[PDB]
Design a protein around this motif. Structure first.
Motif, PDB file in Angstrom:
ATOM      1  N   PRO A   1      10.836   0.683  -6.093  1.00 31.29           N
ATOM      2  CA  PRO A   1      10.172   0.628  -4.794  1.00 31.29           C
ATOM      3  C   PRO A   1       9.025   1.645  -4.716  1.00 31.29           C
ATOM      4  O   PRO A   1       8.992   2.613  -5.468  1.00 31.29           O
ATOM      5  CB  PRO A   1      11.290   1.015  -3.822  1.00 31.29           C
ATOM      6  CG  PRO A   1      12.204   1.899  -4.615  1.00 31.29           C
ATOM      7  CD  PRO A   1      11.955   1.641  -6.096  1.00 31.29           C
ATOM      8  N   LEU A   2       8.101   1.420  -3.789  1.00 33.93           N
ATOM      9  CA  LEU A   2       6.963   2.315  -3.604  1.00 33.93           C
ATOM     10  C   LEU A   2       7.407   3.753  -3.359  1.00 33.93           C
ATOM     11  O   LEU A   2       8.326   4.000  -2.574  1.00 33.93           O
ATOM     12  CB  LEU A   2       6.124   1.854  -2.412  1.00 33.93           C
ATOM     13  CG  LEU A   2       4.848   1.073  -2.687  1.00 33.93           C
ATOM     14  CD1 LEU A   2       4.808   0.559  -4.129  1.00 33.93           C
ATOM     15  CD2 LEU A   2       4.717  -0.063  -1.691  1.00 33.93           C
ATOM     16  N   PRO A   3       6.701   4.702  -3.969  1.00 36.09           N
ATOM     17  CA  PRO A   3       6.947   6.116  -3.706  1.00 36.09           C
ATOM     18  C   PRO A   3       6.175   6.495  -2.437  1.00 36.09           C
ATOM     19  O   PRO A   3       5.443   5.677  -1.882  1.00 36.09           O
ATOM     20  CB  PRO A   3       6.342   6.804  -4.923  1.00 36.09           C
ATOM     21  CG  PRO A   3       5.218   5.912  -5.318  1.00 36.09           C
ATOM     22  CD  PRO A   3       5.650   4.502  -4.982  1.00 36.09           C
TER      23      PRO A   3
ATOM     24  N   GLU B   1       0.818  -1.225   0.000  1.00 39.01           N
ATOM     25  CA  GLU B   1       0.000   0.000   0.000  1.00 39.01           C
ATOM     26  C   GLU B   1       0.847   1.268   0.000  1.00 39.01           C
ATOM     27  O   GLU B   1       1.964   1.281   0.521  1.00 39.01           O
ATOM     28  CB  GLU B   1      -0.919   0.048   1.235  1.00 39.01           C
ATOM     29  CG  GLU B   1      -2.040  -0.984   1.253  1.00 39.01           C
ATOM     30  CD  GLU B   1      -3.317  -0.486   0.591  1.00 39.01           C
ATOM     31  OE1 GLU B   1      -3.768   0.639   0.921  1.00 39.01           O
ATOM     32  OE2 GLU B   1      -3.886  -1.238  -0.233  1.00 39.01           O
ATOM     33  N   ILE B   2       0.269   2.354  -0.505  1.00 40.02           N
ATOM     34  CA  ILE B   2       0.895   3.667  -0.436  1.00 40.02           C
ATOM     35  C   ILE B   2      -0.020   4.523   0.418  1.00 40.02           C
ATOM     36  O   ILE B   2      -1.205   4.648   0.130  1.00 40.02           O
ATOM     37  CB  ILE B   2       1.017   4.326  -1.819  1.00 40.02           C
ATOM     38  CG1 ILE B   2       1.834   3.445  -2.770  1.00 40.02           C
ATOM     39  CG2 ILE B   2       1.630   5.713  -1.692  1.00 40.02           C
ATOM     40  CD1 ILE B   2       1.910   3.981  -4.183  1.00 40.02           C
TER      41      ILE B   2
ATOM     42  N   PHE C   1       1.678   4.383  -9.846  1.00 41.38           N
ATOM     43  CA  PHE C   1       1.356   4.977  -8.561  1.00 41.38           C
ATOM     44  C   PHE C   1       0.826   6.406  -8.688  1.00 41.38           C
ATOM     45  O   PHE C   1       1.220   7.159  -9.583  1.00 41.38           O
ATOM     46  CB  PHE C   1       2.574   4.932  -7.634  1.00 41.38           C
ATOM     47  CG  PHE C   1       3.344   3.639  -7.708  1.00 41.38           C
ATOM     48  CD1 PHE C   1       4.659   3.621  -8.138  1.00 41.38           C
ATOM     49  CD2 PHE C   1       2.747   2.441  -7.354  1.00 41.38           C
ATOM     50  CE1 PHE C   1       5.363   2.423  -8.230  1.00 41.38           C
ATOM     51  CE2 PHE C   1       3.443   1.243  -7.449  1.00 41.38           C
ATOM     52  CZ  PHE C   1       4.761   1.242  -7.865  1.00 41.38           C
ATOM     53  N   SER C   2      -0.091   6.757  -7.795  1.00 38.90           N
ATOM     54  CA  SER C   2      -0.680   8.086  -7.778  1.00 38.90           C
ATOM     55  C   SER C   2      -0.938   8.518  -6.352  1.00 38.90           C
ATOM     56  O   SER C   2      -1.078   7.686  -5.450  1.00 38.90           O
ATOM     57  CB  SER C   2      -1.989   8.110  -8.575  1.00 38.90           C
ATOM     58  OG  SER C   2      -3.061   7.566  -7.816  1.00 38.90           O
TER      59      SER C   2
ATOM     60  N   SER D   1       5.959   4.403 -11.375  1.00 34.96           N
ATOM     61  CA  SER D   1       5.552   3.097 -11.876  1.00 34.96           C
ATOM     62  C   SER D   1       6.549   2.025 -11.452  1.00 34.96           C
ATOM     63  O   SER D   1       7.644   2.330 -10.993  1.00 34.96           O
ATOM     64  CB  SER D   1       5.451   3.127 -13.402  1.00 34.96           C
ATOM     65  OG  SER D   1       6.715   3.365 -13.984  1.00 34.96           O
ATOM     66  N   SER D   2       6.166   0.767 -11.626  1.00 38.44           N
ATOM     67  CA  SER D   2       7.047  -0.348 -11.323  1.00 38.44           C
ATOM     68  C   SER D   2       6.741  -1.488 -12.292  1.00 38.44           C
ATOM     69  O   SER D   2       5.621  -1.624 -12.774  1.00 38.44           O
ATOM     70  CB  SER D   2       6.886  -0.804  -9.878  1.00 38.44           C
ATOM     71  OG  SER D   2       7.925  -1.685  -9.524  1.00 38.44           O
ATOM     72  N   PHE D   3       7.758  -2.274 -12.608  1.00 40.53           N
ATOM     73  CA  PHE D   3       7.635  -3.343 -13.595  1.00 40.53           C
ATOM     74  C   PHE D   3       8.151  -4.612 -12.947  1.00 40.53           C
ATOM     75  O   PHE D   3       9.120  -4.562 -12.197  1.00 40.53           O
ATOM     76  CB  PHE D   3       8.506  -2.970 -14.812  1.00 40.53           C
ATOM     77  CG  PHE D   3       8.470  -3.964 -15.931  1.00 40.53           C
ATOM     78  CD1 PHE D   3       9.393  -5.002 -15.979  1.00 40.53           C
ATOM     79  CD2 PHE D   3       7.647  -3.760 -17.025  1.00 40.53           C
ATOM     80  CE1 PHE D   3       9.423  -5.875 -17.040  1.00 40.53           C
ATOM     81  CE2 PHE D   3       7.665  -4.639 -18.087  1.00 40.53           C
ATOM     82  CZ  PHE D   3       8.564  -5.693 -18.097  1.00 40.53           C
TER      83      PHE D   3
END
Lengths: 254, 253
Positions: free
Chosen positions: B183-185, B135-136, B155-156, B168-170
């Protein structure tokens, strides 16, 4: 002859003769002060036709006074001025505060009748009383635009994510001996979003009983299903109504 | 002393070099015909010996499947990966490539069928899945198409928050597995500048920090009339904090 002629001329007064120019002995004639003139308390205002065709003596009995002191909202004339109408130049009257006003000790509560037949300049010798501190509303605010004295108005609001229950405003009004707030402090109640939507072949991770402003619900697809959409949605709150940020994701197979 | 034409071998053709007569000690090699592969450990050539006689040769070609087609989920195991002879009935085994995993309920084996074709292919090696994104705080993760090897996620940050870090992540293969490329922002609350003060007026209960949709109420000093809006609110002019409008004014009476 048993009759008097015209009565004496009194400055600033006119006698009531009632259509005649000759008056019989013992005739009593009363005078009435002229416009812009008031009779002086404790003075004769009439004459009498005595023997020898002679009128009794009479002296000027009229003045020359201010008008009744103008009506104030903060103060009322004290006795005995409140029942008086004769106010010659130099006359000073005293006031006492009305409710809900209180004395401003530094100032005189007296007015003087000036030479020009006007009352002296008015000062704020009686000021507006103050209502209690309005305090605070948990999760809300109080708007005090113009103080908290007698006659003041204050408004209430609830922060984003809370709903107001109770009065939206209050006024400092006179309450018996003092001044008090018309309405009590209202309540700011947490707004809840509707229960989050369930999805086919997916679940809500640890669903909660209630969801408030900005609180989120995370979704997860069942084994074999692919997620397509937002992994989670959150509670938005506008115009006191809750609403989810958007639609829940979809769990498609396979 | 020259031999004539070499023997006829079923399903094989000899290389004669356009010759019809061959001298003693001449060695002729045969090549299997289409769809046939030579049997390991078997003679594929003859030699012209004394007496104008060719040496004996037996059929050495068996109908064979072709080398298995390349799959992106798995690769042939040893020793099949180096082989080219696959007669009917031959079964080869596969092993997963990266980043793929085995589907236990399935077989990682292919059989050469009677028609010279390999059996039907199943998903015995499935794409690996990157770990649950997580989660963010005060943000969201959009998973458009699953979280398996090769997938992309974005991500937003919710209204009133600014994204710091990757957008973003791939799902990438990393050594012995698959992991998210980024990694998560972090979603950090945006603050409006400190609210403006006004002449002959005050801010009712000012705070140290103001975020999105938060308001500041003004009040004029005794003896002044307010001109303009009584309160203003913290808007977000992306991705910046800005007040909804100017503060009111206080006019002396």
């Amino acid at each position: 002859m048993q009759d008097c002629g015209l009565p004496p001329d009194v400055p600033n007064a006119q006698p009531a003769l009632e259509g005649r120019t000759s008056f019989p002995e013992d005739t009593v004639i009363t005078y009435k002060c002229e416009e812009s003139f008031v009779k002086i308390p404790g003075e004769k205002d009439s004459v009498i036709c005595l023997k020898g065709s002679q009128w009794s003596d009479i002296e000027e009995f009229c003045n020359r006074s201010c008008e009744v002191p103008t009506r104030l909202n903060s103060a009322s004339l004290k006795q005995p001025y409140i029942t008086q109408n004769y106010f010659p130049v130099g006359t000073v009257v005293e006031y006492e505060c009305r409710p809900g006003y209180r004395r401003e000790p530094s100032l005189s509560p007296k007015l003087t009748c000036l030479q020009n037949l006007k009352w002296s300049t008015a000062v704020e010798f009686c000021k507006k009383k103050s209502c209690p501190n309005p305090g605070e509303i948990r999760n809300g605010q109080i708007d005090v635009p113009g103080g908290i004295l007698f006659g003041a108005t204050i408004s209430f609001s609830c922060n984003t994510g809370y709903k107001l229950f109770g009065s939206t405003s209050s006024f400092c009004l006179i309450s018996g001996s003092s001044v008090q707030w018309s309405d009590p402090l209202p309540e700011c109640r947490e707004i809840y979003c509707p229960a989050p939507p369930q999805i086919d072949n997916g679940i809500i991770q640890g669903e909660r009983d209630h969801y408030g402003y900005r609180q989120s619900v995370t979704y997860a697809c069942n084994k074999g299903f692919t997620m397509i959409g937002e992994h989670s949605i959150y509670c938005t709150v506008n115009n006191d109504e809750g609403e989810w940020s958007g639609p829940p994701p979809e769990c498609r197979g396979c």
